[PDB]
Design a protein around this ligand. Structure first.
Ligand SMILES: CCn1c2ccc(C[NH2+]C)cc2c2ccc(-c3cnoc3)cc21
Ligand SMILES: [Zn+2]
Length: 196
C-alpha cells in the first residue's frame, strides 16, 4: 500500500513552514515554495517548522516518513542504499537503514512498520519556546537522491503527520526532497526549468 499524501490541516490548523535560506552555492538546505521542494546536502540539518492555530492535546506526536513520488515506484519502501546502511554513522538511536533522522531529540522513536515495512521517525509535539511563534524539528536525510541501489535518482516526498497518542491522524502536510551536493544551484536550475 501507499500512505496518503493529502494535505489536511485538521482541527488544529496544522501546517509546515520553512526558512528563507536563499540559493547561494554554499547553502546546505533551502526550500522552494514554487516547487514545494526541499533541497539539502547529505546528513545536514534541515529545519522544518510546525504551525497550528490552536493547541493540540498533551501526547500529540509528529511523524515523518518518505515515499517515492512517481506512481511506478510509490509501493517500494524508501531506505538507505547498500553503502550507507553499512557506514556505521549511527547516532545511537536511528536504525542504520532509516533515511530520515531527527537531530538532537532524545525522545525520537523510530518505527519499522510490521505490516508495510516502511520506516518513520516520530517525536512528541512540543509547544514553541517562550518568545517563539512556532516549533522547529531538525531533520537529517542520510542518503543522496542519486545513491545507487537506494533512491537511485528517483524523487521522494516527505509526509509529516500530526497524530494523537494512539497514532490516529490529526493533520498532514508534505514536501518533495532532493538530497544533493549543491542545493543552491539545483534549486535555481529546477525553478528556472519550471518557469521555462
Ligand atoms: C505544533 C507546535 N505548536 C505550535 C506552533 C505554532 C503556534 C502559534 N504561535 C503563534 C502554537 C503552537 C503550539 C501550542 C501548543 C502545543 C502543544 C501543547 N501540548 O503539545 C503540543 C504545540 C504547539
Ligand atoms: Zn546512500
Amino acid at each position: 500500500s501507499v500512505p496518503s499524501q493529502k494535505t489536511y490541516q485538521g482541527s488544529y490548523g496544522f501546517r509546515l513552514g520553512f526558512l528563507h535560506s536563499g540559493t547561494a552555492k554554499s547553502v546546505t538546505c533551502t526550500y522552494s515554495p514554487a516547487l514545494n521542494k526541499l533541497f539539502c546536502q547529505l546528513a545536514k540539518t534541515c529545519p522544518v517548522q510546525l504551525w497550528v492555530d490552536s493547541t493540540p492535546p498533551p501526547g500529540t506526536r509528529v511523524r515523518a516518513m518518505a515515499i517515492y513520488k512517481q506512481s511506478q515506484h510509490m509501493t517500494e519502501v524508501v531506505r538507505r542504499c547498500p553503502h550507507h546502511e553499512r557506514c556505521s554513522d549511527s547516532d545511537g538511536l536511528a536504525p542504520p537503514q532509516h533515511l530520515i533522522r531527527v537531530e538532537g531529540n532524545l525522545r525520537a522513536e523510530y518505527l519499522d512498520d510490521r505490516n508495510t515495512f516502511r520506516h518513520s521517525v516520530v517525536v512528541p509535539c512540543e509547544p514553541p519556546e517562550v518568545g517563539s511563534d512556532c516549533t522547529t524539528i531538525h531533520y537529517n536525510y542520510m542518503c543522496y537522491s542519486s545513491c545507487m541501489g537506494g533512491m537511485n535518482r528517483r524523487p521522494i516526498l516527505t509526509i509529516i503527520t500530526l497524530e494523537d497518542s494512539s497514532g490516529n491522524l490529526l493533520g498532514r502536510d508534505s514536501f518533495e526532497v532532493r538530497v544533493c551536493a549543491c542545493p543552491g544551484r539545483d534549486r535555481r536550475t529546477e525553478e528556472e526549468n519550471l518557469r521555462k
